A paper describes a structure:
TRPV4 is a polymodal, calcium-permeable cation channel that has emerged as a potential therapeutic target in multiple conditions. TRPV4, expressed in the plasma membrane of a wide range of cell types, is a polymodal ion channel whose gating is controlled by multiple endogenous lipids, and exogenous stimuli including synthetic ligands, cell swelling, shear stress, moderate heat, and ultraviolet light. Human TRPV4 adopts a two-layered homotetrameric architecture where RhoA attaches to the bottom layer. RhoA appears to act as an auxiliary subunit, interacting with the ARD through three loops connecting AR2-AR3, AR3-AR4, AR4-AR5, and with the membrane bilayer through the prenylated C-terminal tail.
Residue numbers in the entry:
A (entry chain C): 150 to 490, 506 to 532, 549 to 637, 663 to 788
B (entry chain H): 1 to 190
C (entry chain D): 362 to 490, 506 to 532, 549 to 631
D (entry chain D): 722 to 788
E (entry chain A): 632 to 637, 663 to 721
The structure:
């Protein structure tokens, strides 16, 4: 019976299988029948045999294959997938590869086993989706992921049925995508992954001269380099960016060339294909600092061709055009300041004030703490309706908005290098500590106001509250105290309340420097570059294609004669480095 | 270039030729002696318009114990051939009644091709006499056309496993429908 | 043998946790033995592996809540008095257990306990102030204070919370009396409640450090500084 | 605060741990039993033959080093 | 603040506002205001903003500078 066969397969004893074929032929049963398969997952005999091995050797496999060929169900026998959601789609070849049995992998390949079978069960998804191990759901990608080069070589060089390296799964990821996915920042992992990546790329180049594997994209539309940048896998991204290959036939696949040297000074070209602004395709630099959500983002800018690109951009826009954007808000602030205040000219400027607010809102909607700026734009609106009405409350709206504008000036300070750290520190304090401290203090103050009211024994509370604020200033006299049923208790409390409000706020400053600014102090320089980078990117985004094309960084270079014969002309950005060591 | 894998599944009443229809498509040889209850784990190569597609053909039967396991063949389905028999009118009316809700329940937003098999038997004297015994007639093409529009069918064709008539075109349209990636989403949440 | 207990009722693992001997406790928790006959004596088993990912079981016998026997985790953070307590939580099966607990209660149920005190604060705030409904709420105010005291006595800076509960009591007797001094008692208690809100802030991750820092300053430095300053001020007043 | 600054993260976990413990203590045995962490597993056949069933909490760890 | 009150009228306000920062001067401006209700919150808010930004300077000075 099925349990007996499963136990026999578990032991590995070929002798116990004797007589199986006569039984099956007499009963006209198949090894893929439901009875023999395990109902829970559809598991067949061969997976059970593969999962158990004695010193990596199981003698039942050939007999199982022989009887499966005898009955004539070998195709169904080897292609039978698991149907459980947990292990959906798994086949014998997946187990054979996972167990590092080269000879068994070769045997299964020789016996017509499907080589493009997918395993899309929930156990094979990424961590985010609840799965445990993700490798691309292909046997070739599985072999590549688990550091098994011989199996990759065999699968790609077998005579019976080769496995196209370009094959894509349901997600659209190719083998390179999976390699990027499983990589991490640990040194050994990055080393092995890089070696596997280079071997795979060269093999694909030899097999497919016309095509370029990295060009292939997934359903989401990511190239391996772009995904590596997004997900934060630093090592593989750095290796992909500085790929250099000596082989002449595959020279076009590498990125960083070396043009000339004059002794201790070298000048090496780099490749900005899919790495620069004003390009229709997504930019790696842009996605690295727009939707990265990577904890290693700060270290991703240290790469040679990445860091310098921003300085070259800095010359064009950074240091010369920040003035203009700053000045625009200064002029808008003046136009608004004229509000409170040549009647015709004054009215024209008054119209210009509403126009400037509307322009700020129009560019705000296009761009979408810009929610603060959104609040400013929101507040501008009500004034026009109430001004047409003649209502008297439009002044309050204008007050809120005006103070918001002068406060927005701080955002302009942030862009400049000198004030870049101070502005960000002020904002962080206002958001992390200051916000929570104010939130708590407001409720505490309201409750203590109620306590003071009780001691005095809505309007009676309003007078007390306003005069208590004056008391905090100290200008106001103690009118409340005189009209109190029990001042003796209140007097100590009133001093105590002031101490508690102040001392908790005094602690905030101590809390801010270490608890909140402790991490800011260390990473401020990295954050400032990020802040500078985001500001630089927005300037280029605003300019239209013609304006962007005016200042495409780097110089076009014909790296060398291509296979077609027309030299490959990447847009390259030269990098100059000198090094006395070596020759 | 690089073959794309599309999953095709066939659902229909028994004895309407689903297994035979796939078999003729697979080896182009009508089995005159032995027909398995199900034809599984086969992938066929087809080219329609400049694209090479590997079509994985699943098969569903419900004679005995297969109905319990039928649902777990629906996931990750790319295209469906809902099949019935032209020489058996009883098959048609059950499609809207029972077959459709199960297909929609387990796998919605999937293309469906409603097909009627064995066009030869509608003109056969034996089948015509048998249906006339109950004051019935073979499923008329007009009824099939009306049904296809009624239940949102992608396309309606007719097959003949014995004569190998229209099989290539039917599966050709099946994969053509499969290659379309639906239309985004409807009434998606925010 | 490990089952055997002393007169005090400690198993070797529990005593190791209490006294702070880190190394032996870590070794006892992650004991793995290859011998088949003695396999049942070890704790951490390994169920399956699929390549570079492994999933090993652990043993929570005498290491989890809702158990009649004393919990090692509970005694490690209730009566430890160990200078290495912070390093005892780094052990693999110890640290993760708290995150698994965190999903169930930590991140979803802290809101409710916080909200209970907020509602009680509102009920009390109604004190100073539909006569029948208002009187019902007034009774609810004393009931809420009494409930806080009843749960306080059961739990025993909860001595501050005890002070709040203590102060609630006098008000009922004086309210029946009609005396005029119950207001002072209510004032003390009301300010104590709004201050207690800080304890609710402490639980949340965002305010967890700020609340504790404020308390520590109020206890270590602020307390002594105020104590000295009061006497200095009195003497200077005499001068 | 010199010692508080260094050990605040450790103290916060302790503070979090104490708060978590009190919540479970309040709930009665039935409520606690509702959310006993881990999954019951029969580790293996015991000497008696009935498999030993400890209440086990699975831990997932990946490691490239070794095989 | 001048707009809320509704050159010399600004000079009086400015000098008395400096006195207000000291606290010796009385709130003469507030009495002569078309919309004090909005101003009252703002006047406190303005003082907080001036001081808190200056308070941050001390934090900025010790570490950043
Ligand atoms: N004469 C004739 N018989 C057919 C044809 N196609 C199918 N059949 C018959 O239909 C019977 C059952 O069809 P089958 O493949 O089992 O359909 P299924 O039960 O849905 O899988 C077979 O025994 C065939 O003889 C055809 O084109 N001509
Ligand atoms: Mg069949």
């Amino acid at each position: 019976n099925r349990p007996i066969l499963f136990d026999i397969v578990s032991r590995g004893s070929t002798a116990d299988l004797d007589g199986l074929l006569p039984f099956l032929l007499t009963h006209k049963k198949r090894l893929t029948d439901e009875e023999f398969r395990e109902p829970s997952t559809g598991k067949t005999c061969l997976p059970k045999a593969l999962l158990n091995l004695s010193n990596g050797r199981n003698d039942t496999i050939p007999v199982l294959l022989d009887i499966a060929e005898r009955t004539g169900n070998m195709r169904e026998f080897i292609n039978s997938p698991f149907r459980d959601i947990y292990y959906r789609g798994q086949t014998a070849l997946h187990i054979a590869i996972e167990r590092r049995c080269k000879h068994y992998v070769e045997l299964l390949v020789a016996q017509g086993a499907d080589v493009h079978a997918q395993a899309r069960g929930r156990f094979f998804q990424p961590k985010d989706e609840g799965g445990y191990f993700y490798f691309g759901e292909l046997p070739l990608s599985l072999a590549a992921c688990t550091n098994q080069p011989h199996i990759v070589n065999y699968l790609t060089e077998n005579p019976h049925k080769k496995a196209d390296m370009r094959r894509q799964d349901s997600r659209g990821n190719t083998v390179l995508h999976a390699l990027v996915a499983i990589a991490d920042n640990t040194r050994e992992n990055t080393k092995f992954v890089t070696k596997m990546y280079d071997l795979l790329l060269l093999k694909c180049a030899r097999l497919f001269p016309d095509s370029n594997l990295e060009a292939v994209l997934n359903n989401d539309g990511l190239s391996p380099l772009m995904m590596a940048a997004k997900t934060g896998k630093i090592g593989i991204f750095q290796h992909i960016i500085r790929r250099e290959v000596t082989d002449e036939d595959t020279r076009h696949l590498s990125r960083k060339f070396k043009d000339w040297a004059y002794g201790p000074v070298y000048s090496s070209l780099y490749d900005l294909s899919s790495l620069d602004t004003c390009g229709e395709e997504a930019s790696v630099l842009e996605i690295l600092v727009y939707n990265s959500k990577i904890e290693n983002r700060h270290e991703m800018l240290a790469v040679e061709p990445i860091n310098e690109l921003l300085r070259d951009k800095w010359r064009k826009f950074g240091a010369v055009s920040f003035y203009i954007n700053v000045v625009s808000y200064l002029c808008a602030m003046v136009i608004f300041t004229l509000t409170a205040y040549v009647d015709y000219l004054r009215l024209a400027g008054e119209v210009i004030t509403l126009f400037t607010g509307v322009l700020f809102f129009f560019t705000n909607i296009k761009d979408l703490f810009q929610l603060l700026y959104f609040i400013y734009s929101v507040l501008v609106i009500v004034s026009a309706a109430l001004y047409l009405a003649g209502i008297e409350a439009y002044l309050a709206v204008m007050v809120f908005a005006l103070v918001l504008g002068w406060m927005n000036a701080l955002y302009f300070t942030r862009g400049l290098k000198l004030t870049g750290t101070y502005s960000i520190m002020i904002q962080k304090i206002l958001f992390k500590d200051l916000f929570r401290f104010l939130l708590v203090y407001l409720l505490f103050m309201i409750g203590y106001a109620s306590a003071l009211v009780s001691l005095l024994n809505s309007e009676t509370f309003s007078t007390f509250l306003l005069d208590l604020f004056k008391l905090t200033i100290g200008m106001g006299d103690l009118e409340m105290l005189s009209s109190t049923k029990y001042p003796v208790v209140f007097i100590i409390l009133l001093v105590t309340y002031i101490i508690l409000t102040f001392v908790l706020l005094l602690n905030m400053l101590i809390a801010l420097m270490g608890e909140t600014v402790g991490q800011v102090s260390k990473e401020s320089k990295h954050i400032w570059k990020l802040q500078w980078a985001t500001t630089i990117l927005d300037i280029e985004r605003s300019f239209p294609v013609f304006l962007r094309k005016a200042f495409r960084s780097g110089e076009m270079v014909t790296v060398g004669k291509s296979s077609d014969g027309t030299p490959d002309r990447r847009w390259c950005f030269r990098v100059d480095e000198v090094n006395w060591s070596h020759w | 270039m690089a073959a794309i894998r599309k999953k095709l599944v066939i659902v229909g009443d028994g004895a309407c030729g689903k297994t035979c229809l796939l078999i003729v498509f697979s080896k182009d040889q009508f089995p005159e002696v032995y027909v398995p209850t199900v034809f599984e784990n086969y992938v066929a190569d087809i080219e329609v318009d400049g694209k090479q597609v590997e079509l994985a053909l699943w098969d569903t039967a419900g004679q005995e114990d297969y109905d319990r396991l039928r649902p777990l063949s629906y996931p990750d389905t790319d295209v469906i051939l809902m099949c019935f028999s032209i020489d058996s009118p009883d098959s048609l009316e059950n499609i809207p009644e029972k077959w459709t809700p199960e297909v929609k329940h387990f796998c919605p937003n999937v293309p469906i091709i409603l097909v009627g098999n064995k066009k030869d038997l509608r003109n056969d004297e034996h089948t015509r006499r048998e249906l006339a015994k109950m004051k019935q007639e073979p499923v008329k093409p007009e009824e099939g056309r009306d049904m296809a529009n009624r239940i949102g069918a992608f396309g309606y064709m007719e097959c003949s496993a014995k004569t190998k008539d229209g099989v290539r075109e039917v599966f050709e349209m099946a994969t053509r429908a499969a290659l379309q990636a639906r239309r985004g989403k409807k009434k998606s949440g925010c």
